[PDB]
Amino acid sequence: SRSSLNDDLLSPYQPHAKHGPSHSYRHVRDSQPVIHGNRTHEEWPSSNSTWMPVATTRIFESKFPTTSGMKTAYGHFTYVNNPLRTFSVLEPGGPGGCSKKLTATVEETIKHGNCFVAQNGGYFDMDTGNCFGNIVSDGKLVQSAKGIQNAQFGIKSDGTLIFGYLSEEQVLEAENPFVQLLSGVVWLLRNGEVYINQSKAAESDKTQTTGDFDHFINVISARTAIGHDREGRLIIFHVDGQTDDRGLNLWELANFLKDQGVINAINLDGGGSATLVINGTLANYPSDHCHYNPMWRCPRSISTVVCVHEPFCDPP
Amino acid sequence: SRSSLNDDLLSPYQPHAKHGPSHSYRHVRDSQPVIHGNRTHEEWPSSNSTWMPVATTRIFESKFPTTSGMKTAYGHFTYVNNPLRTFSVLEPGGPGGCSKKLTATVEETIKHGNCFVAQNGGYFDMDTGNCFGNIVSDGKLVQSAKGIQNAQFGIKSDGTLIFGYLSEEQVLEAENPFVQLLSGVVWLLRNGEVYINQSKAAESDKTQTTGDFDHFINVISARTAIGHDREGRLIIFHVDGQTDDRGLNLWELANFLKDQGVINAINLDGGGSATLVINGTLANYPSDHCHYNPMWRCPRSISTVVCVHEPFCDPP
Numbered sequence A, B: 001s002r003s004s005l006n007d008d009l010l011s012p013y014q015p016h017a018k019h020g021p022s023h024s025y026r027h028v029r030d031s032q033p034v035i036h037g038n039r040t041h042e043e044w045p046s047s048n049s050t051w052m053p054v055a056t057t058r059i060f061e062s063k064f065p066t067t068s069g070m071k072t073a074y075g076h077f078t079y080v081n082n083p084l085r086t087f088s089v090l091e092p093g094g095p096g097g098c099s100k101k102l103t104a105t106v107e108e109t110i111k112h113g114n115c116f117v118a119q120n121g122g123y124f125d126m127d128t129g130n131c132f133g134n135i136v137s138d139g140k141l142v143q144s145a146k147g148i149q150n151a152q153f154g155i156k157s158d159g160t161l162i163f164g165y166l167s168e169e170q171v172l173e174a175e176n177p178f179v180q181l182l183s184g185v186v187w188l189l190r191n192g193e194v195y196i197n198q199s200k201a202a203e204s205d206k207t208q209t210t211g212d213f214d215h216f217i218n219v220i221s222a223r224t225a226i227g228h229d230r231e232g233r234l235i236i237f238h239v240d241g242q243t244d245d246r247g248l249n250l251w252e253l254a255n256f257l258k259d260q261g262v263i264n265a266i267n268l269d270g271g272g273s274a275t276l277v278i279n280g281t282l283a284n285y286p287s288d289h290c291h292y293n294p295m296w297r298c299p300r301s302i303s304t305v306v307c308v309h310e311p312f313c314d315p316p
């Protein structure tokens, strides 16, 4: 059930199946900056504010300097209050989706879920539909990365925001467990600092050529990100573009989020996967072309989804 | 109740109050190309197809040639079937709005109207909120231009699409009367041909300097347009931008619609007024900045609205 032609492909690794670095979690800890010691992640309390509304979306059309003048980037910031109760990680098509290797547009996945805001989530194998990385959907472990080291984001049972690199046992921890968790590629910001260089060492093997991953970081394209600010509010970011023509690169994206006050953030699936569905209707410009017409752009059939909804078992 | 700062102002005439040319309808007929004789308008039957859905929206991110390389324009085409029964022209805030000189975002105006698709409509005085040009809202004459000559679009009682320059009596005709009618500025396409040069002669006085109006045509900015194709389907177009930075000019916009098969079309309010609300949620990038923050973009409080809705007194 392809909806788009998947022609704006921004792939970090080649081939698509060999996703993530093969080196050990030990090596991530060993090769990260000494200032961090043996902490491969960062924690922050999620906001408990019950103010209305849950999510506030803000539009931007901002200029960025290039060697050939300036460039404009269209996108949105979404600020989420009470992410413990309002933020969820959904499988494609509904519960049990990743095990069937389903791909579905964000519109299709949240069909009945009543998601105020929703964007595409983590990475996936384009040919097979296989989900990539750790996935915890509303308290239930969907799958595990078996120790593969990419940037992670999750919410704990007590409402603690987790960003960074997690070992397998940290993911499968039974005490204060993850209630929401997904995996991206590249740790954008760590404790208010740009963390691109450090992500190269952590999420790409030294045996391989520093070519395919560097292109993933330096090329401009559509991007999505998820982070947080001082107030414990979730940041669900997306910037429209077209790989090697429009958008931002992870260096620009990192500084953009940092300038706006994001402490920690990770890069989620970008390119033609970038999708923003506000209150049921698509609200951004996807970069894939439609299955049916060669000049009309369509959203992509993606994997997991990040959804913001009403609190659960609380106001009513 | 300003929602935006009205800082992306694309004004055709100066001052805003002296809207439209002062010359006579006689002069429009006299100074138009002889090939058209004494016909100052064009007619086309509206489609009677009851196929589902009523409106189909299509995204584009298209390149346009500039002297300094290429430029990209984000926007939407909306194709409307059965416009006689599904297309309406709404006053700001609801019936009786233009007489009170109300301005309201498209979201606010269609609050309960259940409009599948909706865009900003005609022009208005920014300082006073006064509506400009002829306005017929669901069969009821709201106001008249008193013979002021700008590009017009309307639907007749029998379903005939009217595009072009109308004299006052043509507007107030009691036999086969207008059921929907609004006024823009600049006739983009006339019978499948670019009609910009001809609009200069018709919609700007020769006494005035050819400076303020030429800038309105040659500057690039956000634009909205309404036209039709061979099949009698309505075209509701919009292209995001920022005056003198992003978007298209009426020359580019005319050829863009012509290349896509639009026979007749007129230019409606552009700049920061450009707004597209799909199924209740804003689906484009407005160019005005928000009243509350200096870097977030907000939609504008505009005047009339073009709404696409379900057929009236027909399926149920």
Ligand SMILES: *[C@@H]1O[C@H](CO[C@@H]2O[C@@H](C)[C@@H](O)[C@@H](O)[C@@H]2O)[C@@H](O[C@@H]2O[C@H](CO)[C@@H](O)[C@H](O)[C@H]2NC(C)=O)[C@H](O)[C@H]1NC(C)=O
Pocket (backbone or CB within 6 Å): A037, A038
């Ligand atoms: C992670 O490291 C901390 C800090 O200790 C580091 O290691 C030392 C060699 C020294 O160089 C410090 O400056 C480093 O920052 C460990 O903290 C402790 O480990 C020792 C174990 O003998 C214990 O005496 C302390 O109480 C520990 N403190 C805490 C808070 O745990 C920590 O054990 C290391 N964690 C893991 C999982 O290895």
Ligand SMILES: *[C@@H]1O[C@H](CO[C@@H]2O[C@@H](C)[C@@H](O)[C@@H](O)[C@@H]2O)[C@@H](O[C@@H]2O[C@H](CO)[C@@H](O)[C@H](O)[C@H]2NC(C)=O)[C@H](O)[C@H]1NC(C)=O
Pocket (backbone or CB within 6 Å): B037, B038
């Ligand atoms: C609008 O013009 C048409 C066409 O006539 C034009 O005028 C002539 C002088 C000649 O140069 C034609 O080639 C032009 O195109 C008018 O058509 C007619 O008018 C005369 C009136 O004496 C009549 O004999 C014809 O039957 C008319 N035909 C039609 C279809 O009306 C027409 O009257 C003009 N309309 C208006 C409102 O002035």
Ligand SMILES: *[C@@H]1O[C@H](CO)[C@@H](O[C@@H]2O[C@H](CO)[C@@H](O)[C@H](O)[C@H]2NC(C)=O)[C@H](O)[C@H]1NC(C)=O
Pocket (backbone or CB within 6 Å): A052, A053, A054, A055, A056, A057, A116, A117, A278, A279
């Ligand atoms: C999605 O639609 C809902 C409508 O149910 C919006 O809800 C409200 O927003 C207004 C103003 O923004 C508030 O006054 C209400 O209190 C909100 N209601 C609820 C239940 O939250 C909601 O804002 C929309 N979401 C987005 C992102 O636009």
Ligand SMILES: *[C@@H]1O[C@H](CO)[C@@H](O[C@@H]2O[C@H](CO)[C@@H](O)[C@H](O)[C@H]2NC(C)=O)[C@H](O)[C@H]1NC(C)=O
Pocket (backbone or CB within 6 Å): B052, B053, B054, B055, B056, B057, B116, B117, B278, B279
């Ligand atoms: C606005 O939302 C409505 C939901 O009620 C959409 O309705 C349908 O679209 C699907 C597929 O596009 C069709 O299978 C249905 O028959 C449509 N239903 C109706 C009542 O028209 C509608 O398409 C949406 N409009 C836009 C512009 O996105």
Ligand SMILES: *[C@@H]1O[C@H](CO)[C@@H](O)[C@H](O)[C@H]1NC(C)=O
Pocket (backbone or CB within 6 Å): A197
């Ligand atoms: C950091 O990244 C820059 C890219 O601008 C590179 O030139 C530099 O060598 C990197 N430094 C380290 C220590 O990785």
Ligand SMILES: *[C@@H]1O[C@H](CO)[C@@H](O)[C@H](O)[C@H]1NC(C)=O
Pocket (backbone or CB within 6 Å): B197
């Ligand atoms: C038509 O418009 C062009 C603008 O490119 C102008 O140069 C030309 O003089 C115009 N011709 C007429 C007859 O108005």
Ligand SMILES: [K+]
Pocket (backbone or CB within 6 Å): A001, A002, A102, A103, A104, A301
């Ligand atoms: K599928």
Ligand SMILES: [K+]
Pocket (backbone or CB within 6 Å): A007, A008, A242, A287, A288, A289
């Ligand atoms: K593309």
Ligand SMILES: [K+]
Pocket (backbone or CB within 6 Å): A029, A030, A031, A032, A033, A034, A037
């Ligand atoms: K270290």
Ligand SMILES: [K+]
Pocket (backbone or CB within 6 Å): A033, A035, A193
């Ligand atoms: K560091």
Ligand SMILES: [K+]
Pocket (backbone or CB within 6 Å): A053, A055, A056, A057
């Ligand atoms: K909101």
Ligand SMILES: [K+]
Pocket (backbone or CB within 6 Å): A057, A058, A059, B290, B296, B297, B298
């Ligand atoms: K906003």
Ligand SMILES: [K+]
Pocket (backbone or CB within 6 Å): A010, A011, A123, A124, A126, A269, A273
């Ligand atoms: K991908």
Ligand SMILES: [K+]
Pocket (backbone or CB within 6 Å): A022, A023, A024, A025, A146, A147, A148
């Ligand atoms: K491993």
Ligand SMILES: [K+]
Pocket (backbone or CB within 6 Å): A208, A209, A210, A211, A212, A213
């Ligand atoms: K390589």
Ligand SMILES: [K+]
Pocket (backbone or CB within 6 Å): A194, A251, A255
């Ligand atoms: K930097």
